[PDB]
């Protein structure tokens, strides 16, 4: 269990809810196929969004049993995992499948380092295994070369643009077509596929899709949404969507912290009994719910401030909270030295905001736009307060105490660390200290603005990068009250450009012959950007893999020249994958809009591949723009199964309709306003919980063990609309008078 999960469970305990996973009955050896049209015990669900990376990644190269066969085993595992998730959630309106693709230049800074660290770990473990076999062979035993050559799955090879992504995308389409054809309950379900060709990080695609579904006047505000992902920030990102009917599904990491991890050798000691018990135990994986509707009430009861010149708005209150949480920690910028734990600093930042809010005469952020003087005052107050936090952290570290090593020599607890911290990154020169401080201030402000725009109003630069490795220390951004931030739109990177900007190590061989020849040659124009020994590992507090790299950045112009030089001699078949592509929408044979789609597109009109159809959410759902498919799909045809050894029956094209889906362009800026006609959920909170969250509780102090206990006693929480009227009865009369009479 992560520290963030523990923090959110301690501060907000009721957000943890139990799940109801159906177990199909087994009679006479056979397995009863579970129904899909039956009512879901976990409440009605309409929209489900799934990050396909979060399923294809754990299935491949797992920590218990690596797939012994070829990619086929991983494909079967991800197919059964997706089937289990679909049966658990049971979407009724639209099911969304998205996998990571092209990402903006800011993401390469940390993704490249993570991939290189993983590759180095794989290389060193392979060397250790080779040494183990060499020592074992000295005794006299003989091991087949197949076992020795049976290396890992090369997790670094899973990158957008590789043929593995294309093979996975081809398999996914067949799987969803088979599911739509063979399941009568999928008649109204609509499935979209966002392959690795489509740019996005997996979650930003979901944000764009939900803002495009909210880009229609007739969109129902009462629709429920579910997003499944293992990322910790996923539960936090869904709050920014301003959708009360939201809940996050994820695996129960509380049990998985100390789950079954015994060695395979012990599985044969007791023969049938122990193996049967083990296979029964791991067959069921508990999950949990991360409802956001309840969390909105907790945030409302925790962000209240008495006395304010402006008007307290719940929608605007969450904006400052999400901006501050992103500032404290995100996967786009280096961690602030002051905010390292990222858990205990949240309350300090919140009370700083509470004490500075009366001084300010305006809100923190306005629809993603950061108020420059207000944020300047906030960071000035934090820097004034950061001294006490730094002193307490140093005292705690000293009490606890009682690969380059850089932070140890800094000795931040001693007075005068302002230049001592910067000496670990640059030379000992006075004016250079000020120059680097100003540059870091400008870069950090630009990065904060860029991440706010990306997570609120979508991508705005697509090429911005962070040209630094160490975040500025406390009392930063002293004078910056004159800069104006205005980002420029840039074209997304090509799949090959993004793949080489990820910069896999020499172990990776997903590149074609030309690119690997241009790399492996000792006299390479970009050989300086590709280390071999990788000695850039550096601790900087923390431990284990949490250390960051210090390798030099990559110049975009050199990589562009390299790709433009390698392009002309590449084969046309391989170059055919350079197309950005568009998401593909799949609908059932008996869909409400199926007749209209079959009469408009792929019909007797026989237009020259330029007719598009725009439809609203009044009929069926999934508002958007559909276009002619660019693949080989055609009416009265057949689709070849790519799984091969999967015993999957072939299907015809008359059962599944395939077309290219394009999101509706945003007319105006995506504001944060609750849509009219939204029906609030049932009132579940009590004033006691409001007081509990208003008073500062030191993790409940373990006075009565209220943190952990009858967790299952919280039961399920009702979801969906509750009551025709969207306004709670306050004073008034008639209906409110009758309610008061029946209550009192």
């Amino acid at each position: 269990v992560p520290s963030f999960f523990r923090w959110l469970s301690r501060k907000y305990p009721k957000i943890i809810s139990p799940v109801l996973e159906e177990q199909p009955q087994i009679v006479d050896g056979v397995i009863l196929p579970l129904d899909y049209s039956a009512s879901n015990p976990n409440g009605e669900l309409d929209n489900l969004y799934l990050d396909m990376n979060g399923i294809v990644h754990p299935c491949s190269h797992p920590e218990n049993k690596p797939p012994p066969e070829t990619e086929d085993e991983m494909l079967l595992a991800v197919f059964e995992y997706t089937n289990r998730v679909l049966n658990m959630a049971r979407p009724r309106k639209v099911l969304v499948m998205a996998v990571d693709g092209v990402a903006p230049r800011a993401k390469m800074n940390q993704q490249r380092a993570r991939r290189f660290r993983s590759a180095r770990d794989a290389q060193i473990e392979n060397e250790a295994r080779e040494e183990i076999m060499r020592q074992r062979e000295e005794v006299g035993e003989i091991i087949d070369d197949a076992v020795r050559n049976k290396k890992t799955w090369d997790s670094n090879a899973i990158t957008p643009g590789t043929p593995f992504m294309d093979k996975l995308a081809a398999a996914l389409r067949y799987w969803t077509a088979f599911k739509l054809a063979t399941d009568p309950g999928w008649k109204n379900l609509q499935v979209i596929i966002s392959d690795a060709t489509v740019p996005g990080e997996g979650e930003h695609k979901i944000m764009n899709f939900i803002r495009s579904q909210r880009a229609d006047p007739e969109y129902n505000p009462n629709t429920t949404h579910c997003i499944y992902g293992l990322d910790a920030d996923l539960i936090f990102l869904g709050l920014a969507t301003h959708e009360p009917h939201f809940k996050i599904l994820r695996e129960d990491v509380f049990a998985q912290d100390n789950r079954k991890r015994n060695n395979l050798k012990d599985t044969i000691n007791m023969t049938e009994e122990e193996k049967q018990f083990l296979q029964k135990q791991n067959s069921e994986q508990p999950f949990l719910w991360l409802h956001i509707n309840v969390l909105r009430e907790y945030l409302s009861a925790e962000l209240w401030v008495p006395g304010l010149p402006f008007t307290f708005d719940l929608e605007r209150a969450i904006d400052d909270w999400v901006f501050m949480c992103f500032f404290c920690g995100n996967d786009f910028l280096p961690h602030l030295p002051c905010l390292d734990v990222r858990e205990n600093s949240i309350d300090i930042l919140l009370d700083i905001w509470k004490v500075v809010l009366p001084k300010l005469k305006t809100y923190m952020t306005c629809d993603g736009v950061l108020n420059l003087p207000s944020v300047e005052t906030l960071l000035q107050h934090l820097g004034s307060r950061e001294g006490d936090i730094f002193k307490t952290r140093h005292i705690q570290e000293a009490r606890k105490k009682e690969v380059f090593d850089t932070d140890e020599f800094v000795k931040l607890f001693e007075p005068g660390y302002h230049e001592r911290y910067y000496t670990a990154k640059f030379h000992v020169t006075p004016q250079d200290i000020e120059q680097l401080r100003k540059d870091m201030v400008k870069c950090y402000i630009e990065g904060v603005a860029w991440v706010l725009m990306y997570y609120y109003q979508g991508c705005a630069s697509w090429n911005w990068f962070y040209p630094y490795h160490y975040a500025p220390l406390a009392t930063d951004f002293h004078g910056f009250s004159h800069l104006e931030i205005k980002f420029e739109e840039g074209t997304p990177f090509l799949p090959y450009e993004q793949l080489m900007s990820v910069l896999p190590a020499a172990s990776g061989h997903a590149l074609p012959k030309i690119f690997r020849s241009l790399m492996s040659e000792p006299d390479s124009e970009i050989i300086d950007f590709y280390p071999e020994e990788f000695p850039i590992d550096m601790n900087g507090k923390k431990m284990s893999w949490q250390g960051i790299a210090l390798l030099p950045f990559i110049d975009q112009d050199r990589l562009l020249t390299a790709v433009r030089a390698q392009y002309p001699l590449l084969s046309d078949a391989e170059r055919a994958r350079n197309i950005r592509g568009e998401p593909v929408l799949l609908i059932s044979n008996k869909n409400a809009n199926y007749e209209r789609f079959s009469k408009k597109l792929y019909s007797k009109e026989n237009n020259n591949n330029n007719v598009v159809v725009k439809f609203q959410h009044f009929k069926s759902g999934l508002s958007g723009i559909v276009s002619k498919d660019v693949e080989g799909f055609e009416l009265n045809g057949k689709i070849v199964c790519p799984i091969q050894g999967g015993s999957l029956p072939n299907l015809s094209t008359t059962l599944i309709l395939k077309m290219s889906y394009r999101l509706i362009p945003l007319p105006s800026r995506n504001k944060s306003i609750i849509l009219n006609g939204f029906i609030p959920s049932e009132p579940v909170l009590t004033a006691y919980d409001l007081d509990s969250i208003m008073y500062k509780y030191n993790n409940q102090n373990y006075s009565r063990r209220w943190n952990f206990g009858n967790d299952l006693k919280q039961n399920i929480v009702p979801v969906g609309p509750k009551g025709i009227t969207q306004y709670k009865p306050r004073t008034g009369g008639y209906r409110a008078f009758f309610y008061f009479a029946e209550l009192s």
Binding site: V27, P33, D183, L651
Partner: protein, 171 residues
């Protein structure tokens, strides 16, 4: 095949409804509870007849709390999947596993080793169906199914059917 029985259900009425209309309260409770219940011992309680006839007895007040338990005596139509008989049903789903034949409020499943070897799965036609010589079953078709399943009555009942031997087809 449906049976008319004389079942009994115990309802623990709360003292908050100990008024002149507690009888009608028990009546509506019995309706809202017994209907749609998939009891393992009996099956489905489709409907309760003679609503204005069912009688209640003196409710015994429990020693623990003031709630009173009433032993009602109702009669209703009960459907049980049973075992060892032929029955007619209508398909509602089809897949490689089998066809989901529906008889009344039931969904009897047929596995691979149940039907004879004269059925092969294919998706060439508009409905995904098992097609072979002189056998035509589809999403909506007539089929006679013989039940030989173990039911497995655990808070709900099920059924497994067979297609072996003649007369178990469309006809």
């Amino acid at each position: 095949m449906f049976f008319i029985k004389d079942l009994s259900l115990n309802i623990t009425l709360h003292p908050s409804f100990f008024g002149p209309r507690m009888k009608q309260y028990l009546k509506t409770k019995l309706l809202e509870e017994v209907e749609g219940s998939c009891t393992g011992k009996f099956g489905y309680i489709l409907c309760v007849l003679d609503y204005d006839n069912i009688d209640i007895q003196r409710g015994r007040i429990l020693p623990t709390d003031g709630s009173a338990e009433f032993n009602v005596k109702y009669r209703a139509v009960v459907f049980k999947p049973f075992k060892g008989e032929v029955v007619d049903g209508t398909v509602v789903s089809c897949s490689q596993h089998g066809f989901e034949v529906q008889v009344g409020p039931m969904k009897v499943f047929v596995t691979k080793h149940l039907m004879p070897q004269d059925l092969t799965f294919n998706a060439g036609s508009n409905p995904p169906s098992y097609q072979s010589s002189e056998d035509v079953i589809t999403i909506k078709s007539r089929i006679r199914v013989k039940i030989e399943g173990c039911i497995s009555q655990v808070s709900s009942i099920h059924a497994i059917g067979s297609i072996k031997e003649d007369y178990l087809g469309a006809i």
